[PDB]
Design an enzyme around this catalytic site. Structure first.
Site, mmCIF file in Angstrom:
data_model
loop_
_atom_site.group_PDB
_atom_site.id
_atom_site.type_symbol
_atom_site.label_atom_id
_atom_site.label_comp_id
_atom_site.label_asym_id
_atom_site.label_seq_id
_atom_site.Cartn_x
_atom_site.Cartn_y
_atom_site.Cartn_z
ATOM 1 N N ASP A 1 71.996 76.343 71.576
ATOM 2 C CA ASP A 1 73.120 75.408 71.807
ATOM 3 C C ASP A 1 73.612 74.929 70.444
ATOM 4 O O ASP A 1 72.972 74.169 69.710
ATOM 5 C CB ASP A 1 72.651 74.298 72.737
ATOM 6 C CG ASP A 1 73.780 73.435 73.247
ATOM 7 O OD1 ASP A 1 74.733 73.225 72.452
ATOM 8 O OD2 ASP A 1 73.691 72.985 74.397
ATOM 9 N N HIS B 1 75.753 76.412 74.875
ATOM 10 C CA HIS B 1 76.138 75.145 75.438
ATOM 11 C C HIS B 1 76.899 75.363 76.753
ATOM 12 O O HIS B 1 77.007 74.434 77.553
ATOM 13 C CB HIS B 1 77.082 74.395 74.464
ATOM 14 C CG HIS B 1 77.326 72.966 74.875
ATOM 15 N ND1 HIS B 1 76.255 72.102 75.022
ATOM 16 C CD2 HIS B 1 78.410 72.228 75.141
ATOM 17 C CE1 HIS B 1 76.675 70.926 75.425
ATOM 18 N NE2 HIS B 1 77.998 70.940 75.453
ATOM 19 N N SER C 1 76.433 68.156 79.193
ATOM 20 C CA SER C 1 76.905 67.650 77.887
ATOM 21 C C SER C 1 77.113 66.166 77.840
ATOM 22 O O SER C 1 76.236 65.402 78.267
ATOM 23 C CB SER C 1 78.212 68.468 77.627
ATOM 24 O OG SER C 1 78.495 68.442 76.236
ATOM 25 N N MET C 2 78.311 65.624 77.433
ATOM 26 C CA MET C 2 78.524 64.199 77.448
ATOM 27 C C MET C 2 78.523 63.584 78.809
ATOM 28 O O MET C 2 78.325 62.395 79.010
ATOM 29 C CB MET C 2 79.790 63.760 76.657
ATOM 30 C CG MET C 2 81.073 64.148 77.439
ATOM 31 S SD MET C 2 82.463 63.154 76.808
ATOM 32 C CE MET C 2 82.366 61.680 77.763
ATOM 33 N N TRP D 1 82.846 67.394 77.819
ATOM 34 C CA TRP D 1 84.091 67.380 77.040
ATOM 35 C C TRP D 1 84.370 68.780 76.591
ATOM 36 O O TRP D 1 83.457 69.516 76.169
ATOM 37 C CB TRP D 1 83.751 66.500 75.820
ATOM 38 C CG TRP D 1 84.741 66.321 74.697
ATOM 39 C CD1 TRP D 1 85.647 65.335 74.570
ATOM 40 C CD2 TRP D 1 84.852 67.133 73.517
ATOM 41 N NE1 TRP D 1 86.351 65.464 73.398
ATOM 42 C CE2 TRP D 1 85.872 66.559 72.737
ATOM 43 C CE3 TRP D 1 84.205 68.267 73.029
ATOM 44 C CZ2 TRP D 1 86.268 67.070 71.495
ATOM 45 C CZ3 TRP D 1 84.589 68.790 71.802
ATOM 46 C CH2 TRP D 1 85.623 68.178 71.056
#
Length: 274
Positions: free
Chosen positions: A223, A252, A94-95, A28
């Site tokens: 991160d 990140h 990530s997500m 995202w």
């Protein structure tokens, strides 16, 4: 190209090269353009590189509903089934790591060879007494309020944390921040806020225990979005036989930041020969 899901949703994707498939699953609030560096790297090494845009992101249908991991995983299942892909490596950021985990939980590993979790959310992000190193609820509230207050400025402000661009001497360009904003402007506002609820609170511990394929977990220890101690360090212990590679000083946004992205490409290509 477009894959039409079981629900009539159009999922846009890039499909480059010939060879064993490597399917990239973005985070995202971006889209498959967040992987172009890695797509070129794997296709130049003799793999097929595929990267789809999640519903409501990039050039996929700007849907209202279905911003939950079961739907994301089923959309991924439709893409792998339509293209009849086998011996696949799924690589998630990530997500996107929740989409990868819930795909294993729901559909199993019959089409898969291996998996890579880069700076990913499993097992669970939310802080609690059982997960004291997680992210407090107030952070998720603030992300959702930022998107609803003025999303365009919010992406510009969020890019600073996403790339740890507050660290003196970093290699993040203004271009990286501008590209972050450009990708985020293609996301629906409902996907912007509903994905926060999904990635902040969903627990993938039980899906992770169903992994039975080699898995590489990569995570930076600077991160500022997905805290290493609550996520990458723990998923590497739960997933059977997983390898963990800690990237010292990395943010990140490892796949897009100069220097780190070549380190990740090198690690990814070494892992793909497994």
């Amino acid at each position: 190209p477009i894959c039409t899901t079981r629900d009539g949703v159009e999922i846009f994707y890039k499909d480059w090269g010939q060879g064993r498939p490597v399917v990239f699953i973005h985070g995202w609030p971006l889209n498959g353009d967040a992987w172009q560096d890695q797509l070129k790297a794997v296709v130049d090494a003799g793999y097929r590189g595929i990267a789809h845009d999640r519903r409501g992101h990039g050039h996929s249908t700007p849907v209202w509903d279905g911003y939950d991991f079961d739907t994301f995983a089923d959309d991924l299942n439709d893409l792998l089934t339509d293209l009849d892909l086998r011996d696949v490596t799924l690589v998630a950021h990530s997500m996107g790591g929740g989409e990868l985990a819930r795909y294993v939980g729901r559909h199993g590993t019959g089409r898969l060879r291996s998996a890579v979790l880069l700076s990913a959310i499993p097992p669970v992000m939310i802080k609690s007494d059982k997960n004291p190193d997680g992210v407090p609820d107030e952070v998720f509230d603030a992300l959702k309020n930022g998107v609803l207050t003025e999303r365009s400025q919010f992406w510009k402000d969020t890019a600073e944390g996403f790339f740890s661009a507050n660290r003196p001497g970093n290699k993040v360009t203004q271009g990286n921040k501008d590209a972050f904003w450009y990708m985020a402007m293609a996301q629906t506002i409902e996907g912007g806020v509903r994905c926060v609820d999904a990635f902040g609170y969903t627990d993938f511990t039980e899906d992770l225990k169903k992994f039975d394929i080699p898995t590489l977990v990569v995570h930076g220890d600077d991160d500022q979005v997905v805290p290493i101690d609550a996520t990458g360090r723990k998923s590497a212990q739960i997933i059977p036989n997983a390898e963990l590679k800690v990237y010292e000083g990395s943010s990140h946004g490892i796949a897009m930041v100069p220097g780190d992205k070549e380190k990740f490409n090198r690690d990814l290509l070494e892992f793909l020969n497994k």
